[model samples]
Target: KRINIRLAHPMAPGNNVTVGYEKFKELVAEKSNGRVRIQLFGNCMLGSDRVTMEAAQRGTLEMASSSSPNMANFSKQWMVFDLPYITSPEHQQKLYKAIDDGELGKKLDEIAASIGLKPIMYSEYGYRNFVTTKKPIKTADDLKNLKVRTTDSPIEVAVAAALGMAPTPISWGETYTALQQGTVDGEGNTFSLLNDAKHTEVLKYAIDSAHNYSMHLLMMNKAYYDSLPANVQQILTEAGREALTYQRSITSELEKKAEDAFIEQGITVTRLSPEERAKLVERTRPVWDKFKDDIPAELIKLVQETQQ
Candidate 1:
């Protein structure tokens, strides 16, 4: 029997986000001996991430990808990963994969299945940072009184407030003009996306906040995944695992490349000292407290335990 699948994501063509999906397509075809074929629609050709995710939940879409932390909106158990500073940048993938291989992963997968979506892989977008048009961020106090742009999500706004910033929520499409026209003072994200937006032309500094480890779920419709034969299921399982590893390879390497690109463009880059980062964690604890009701205690405990 011939099997056809559709995959979609919201990234520009040749963007690294879609690299593994292409790889997944290759493996599925090679292993299935041409029995399986995947058609991909990138750059929002299908719809935005939220729309694509809803389509997956309703089983109208075969698969979709999203790096937004707001997936918690669909499955509350996913909120555990949304907690800022939950995973350290060093060895972050290992810590997250450990969670994915154990009880928390099983629990979240169960939660996803309830919504008719199955998570096949947890992939990286990049580690997020801060960009400012003013002096470099050296300490916790440096953030206070600054007008900053952040997503309007409850956790994001709360976190920005806790960190002492005046938060202005705006869509990503408007971020560049917002920075250029002084509508907002700065924004927090990886150098990759912001640099692509040409924010460095207007923003003068990059702070290595790394408050959040960026990630996306490679998810498929539950019914479609369930209908596959055992051998085909094995191929997909193996391919998803391989794709996750491959995704990380480019993710970390780009960190250095993006940093260099930022510096070459005359942006001052600063990393938080361990002591500085500790003070940051202290200030943002309120964000975790506010969102506590959304996640299971055991899930949060497992992530903390895995960090040690």
Candidate 2:
């Protein structure tokens, strides 16, 4: 029998994540020997991240890729990844490996299964930095009173408040227009995402804040996944592992390219000095305590220990 899977994501066609999912589609088909086929959709053609995830939960869709922060409603455990400055550039890979293969990873899987979804793999969306329309942000003071678009996630809201920016909850699909029309003065995102969304066209300055590590999750409807033959399940799982590796391998290089593109387009890029970044980190530290009750203390300790 032939099996078909439909996967949806809300990323631009030019984003590497789109290419990553393409790799997953190709790998799944080859490994299944033509028995399984994946149909891919990007740019939110199917729905927004939360919408697509709910579709997967209801079995109306087969799979989706959503940010870890977006999974907060599924389980507060996922909020652990949303904590700012918890990850470092030099040792993020170790943290990634720990989350992918260690207790934290298995616990996340168990959480997903309990909620009617199955996580296939985790990939980094890159480090979030600030891009603004009016002025460059050099220090936390520069970020003060600036209106910025942000996801409505409480953790993110807390981060914004602590950083002294006005956080406006706007959909990703509408962010470009929001910047151009002056609905918001700035937004924070990974270099590649801003480049792909063409937000650079409307933006004038960038701050390499690296405030938060963005994690992307690939998930499938648990009911659908569990119904697959044993061989097909193994093939899909192994294919996901390899596809994730391929995605992570290229993300850093692509981020460099995107950052250069931003510069070439006349966006003044600012890199925070080690001291400046530390100050911002200290300012946002209170956010961690706000969620202490929701996220497991052990998971937080695990990430901290892994990063060390």
Candidate 3:
């Protein structure tokens, strides 16, 4: 039997997700021996992340690649990824290893299944940096009154507001236009995304805040996954692991290249001192407190343990 899955993301055709998805599809087809086919829709051709997620919930789409925070509304465990400094490369590797083999991943998978989405793999997207159209952001005070675009996640909103900026929630599809039209003064994203979206063309300052790491969840419709034969299920599981490993290896290299490209294109790159970064983290502490009630204590404990 042949099955077709729709995978969607908002990145341009040559972006990380696009490249990763292409590799993933090739691997899946090769491994499955043509039994499974994945049709990818890039640049949000299927719609925005929110729309794609909703489609997954309704089983309108078989699968999706989404930022964890975008799904936080349904699975609070996911919001942990949105917290600043919680996703350092070392920290992320430890957490991902634990999730792949232990209770945390099982718990999250269960939670997602209860809500119609099946958590498969933690796809790496790399660290986010601040890009602005206005003056350079050297200190938290520099963010005052700036209109910064953020996702639908409250953690991002809180982080921006804590820095004294106004956070505006904008769909990824509209972010380029929003930045160009001055609807928002800046936003934080991976360096690759900043360049791929041509945000560097309009945004002059690129700050290496490394505030939080970005991650994507490879999710499938629970019912659809369950309907697959045992052998097909095994094949999909193995393919997901392969995809994650491949993505993690290339993400950082792409980020470095994008940063150099951004600089060559005339975007001012700012490297904050350790002291400055610490101050930004301290200022953003209240954001965690504000959303603690919404997140699971167990997940928080795991994050703390991983941090230690």
Per residue, candidate 1 scores C-alpha lDDT tens digits across 115-224 of 88888878777667878987567788898888989986676788789999999999988888888889888988888777766777888987788876657887898998
RMSD of each: 1.5, 2.0, 2.5
Residue 176 displacement in candidate 1 (angstroms): 1.0
Error of 1 at 26 (Å): 1.4
Instruction: Supply the global lDDT for candidate 1.
Output: 0.80
Winning model by TM-score? 1
Candidate 3 overall lDDT versus native: 0.80
Q: For residues 1-308, what per-residue lDDT tens digits would candidate 2 score against the true structure?
A: 88989999987775677878888899999998899999998888999888998999889999998988888877888888889888878887787788778887777788899989988868668788988998777777899999999977887788888999999999877888889899899998988878876888999988888877777788999999999889988888888888888888789889999999999999999888888888889999999999989998888888887787
For model 3, what is the error of residue 220's alpha carbon versus the real structure, in angstroms, after optimal superposition? Answer: 1.2
Q: lDDT for every model?
A: 0.80, 0.86, 0.80
Off by more than 4 A, model 2: 181-183
Off by over 4 Å in 1: none
| TM-scores of all predicted structures | 0.95, 0.91, 0.88
